[PDB]
Amino acid sequence: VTSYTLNEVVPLKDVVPEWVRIGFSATTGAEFAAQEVHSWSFNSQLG
Amino acid sequence: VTSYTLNEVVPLKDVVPEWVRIGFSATTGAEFAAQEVHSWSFNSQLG
Amino acid sequence: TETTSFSITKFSPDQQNLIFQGDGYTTKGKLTLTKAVKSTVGRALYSTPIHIWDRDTGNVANFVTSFTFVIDAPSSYNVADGFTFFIAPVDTKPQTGGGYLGVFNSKEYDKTSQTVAVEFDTFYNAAWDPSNKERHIGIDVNSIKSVNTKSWNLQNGERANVVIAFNAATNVLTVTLTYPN
Amino acid sequence: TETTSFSITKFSPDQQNLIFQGDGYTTKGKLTLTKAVKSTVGRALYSTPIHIWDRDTGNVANFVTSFTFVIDAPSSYNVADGFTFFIAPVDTKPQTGGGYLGVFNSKEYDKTSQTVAVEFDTFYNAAWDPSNKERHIGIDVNSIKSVNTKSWNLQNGERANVVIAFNAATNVLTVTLTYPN
Ligand SMILES: OC[C@H]1O[C@H](O)[C@H](O)[C@@H](O)[C@@H]1O
Ligand SMILES: OC[C@H]1O[C@H](O)[C@H](O)[C@@H](O)[C@@H]1O
Ligand SMILES: [Ca+2]
Ligand SMILES: [Ca+2]
Ligand SMILES: [Mn+2]
Ligand SMILES: [Mn+2]
DSSP states (O other): OEEEEEEEEOOHHHHSOSEEEEEEEEEOSSSOOEEEEEEEEEEEEEO | OEEEEEEEEOOHHHHSOSEEEEEEEEEOSSSOOEEEEEEEEEEEEEO | OEEEEEEESSOOSSOTTEEEEETOEEETTEEEEEOSOSSOEEEEEEEEEEEOBOTTTOOBOEEEEEEEEEEEOSSSSSOOOEEEEEEEETTOOOOBOGGGTTTBSOSSOOGGGOOEEEEEEOSOOTTTSOTTOOOEEEEEESSSSOSEEEEOOOOTTOOEEEEEEEETTTTEEEEEEEEOO | OEEEEEEESSOOSSOTTEEEEETOEEETTEEEEEOSOSSOEEEEEEEEEEEOBOTTTOOBOEEEEEEEEEEEOSSSSSOOOEEEEEEEETTOOOOBOGGGTTTBSOSSOOGGGOOEEEEEEOSOOTTTSOTTOOOEEEEEESSSSOSEEEEOOOOTTOOEEEEEEEETTTTEEEEEEEEOO
16 A cells, blocks of 8 residues: 655635635646545535 | 425326426415515425 | 435535525534525525436335424414425426425326425425424425325424435335424 | 535446546546546536635635546657646636646636636646646646646556645645555
8 A cells, every 4th residue: 555645734714715626637638547435535524 | 393395296297398407486465464484495405 | 326415414505515495504504494584485405316217127225315404483373384305306396385385286186396305394284294294304205295104393493404315126215203392 | 614525436327426527528437637638627526615715714724635546648749738736716617628637727817717626737838837847736826837846757547646635724735645566
């Protein structure tokens, strides 16, 4: 098992609007690959 | 505390489409009233 | 496996996750569907499509919902017209008003309807409502005529706690309503 | 209090709760964003608006997501271009492709962007990517230039388990990636 962790302070209230959508993005160009999600789960609690 | 329970067999697979929206409805006519939801929570698990 | 869940204990002024139809709107942290006015309809839907069953596996979903509401009448002999929690096709729009409660159009079973509604009926429509002339909780399928009812005593102005659960192994839909006192 | 939650462990052929943009689609129970073709963009969004903070209380939401993905390259020296999980304005549309990964348009901080992206970058764009020329996990805010990175060794074809969490008391966003072996 090979894990990698990164973390940072982002101040969300100031970057993004009160209401947002969430999702996934990918791209190829000159070179390429296939990128695929096999499962996705999410939970948030505001207030 | 005053409770009332009703129950029945509904065969959902046959009444409704695979994908549905859920919600609340109210109406007045000749007579009337104010109807109001103060809180709402939902959970389903398919499969 | 796909699950889904939510909880709003206080409504914003721009609930962007809701669809409002007819006279529904949010004020004071409540969702208000009809104000005490004559002849009006109020509908509010949660916008994500819920996947309630599957062509490919033939599975049906278990589910439960719970909410809180009050009906506030000028008195107890002038109370109309009701309130429904329903499950409908995704493009649902408000149907016929008054005693049809915004979700149906006849008492004749209409298969095109595709709507299951649980109702809290405050007014006897002689033509389909229980002859005992009582206020009632009812389960209706594809028709304004409940396939089953329970008579309940409106406590005008109190906050009712409702829980609705459906069990997919048993095909049983249950409703319980609680008053505090 | 408004909470929200979901889980899809297998994707339907008509995920009606998803928005597909560019080349995204579902097949075989997987969500596929780009096939191994030249020059294409794939985006998929969850459709309900998530309420991430509040004008009136000034609260921000805590949240966590976790997913599984694989990148499948013809070899390991021909691998492009990346993959992102992002948080964006509700009307988001796909931006510039290739090394900009579908969510941005410059390396210059653009406030109008309003996008937080976590990226899994498989190709060095000399102009903004870490000079060490390594594949990396990065956190970017309003720009294709990560404000912070970690170099990671693509295991072409394996299934990565990702968890992203954000803590609203601390304003810290964390990313961990796990390979099985
Ligand atoms: O496929 C890798 C690269 O191909 C093309 O040069 C695109 O312009 C560039 O943005 C991309 O990163
Ligand atoms: O307000 C109570 C009643 O008023 C009007 O007669 C409407 O036609 C009827 O459907 C409704 O039930
Ligand atoms: Ca009636
Ligand atoms: Ca790059
Ligand atoms: Mn009735
Ligand atoms: Mn990069």
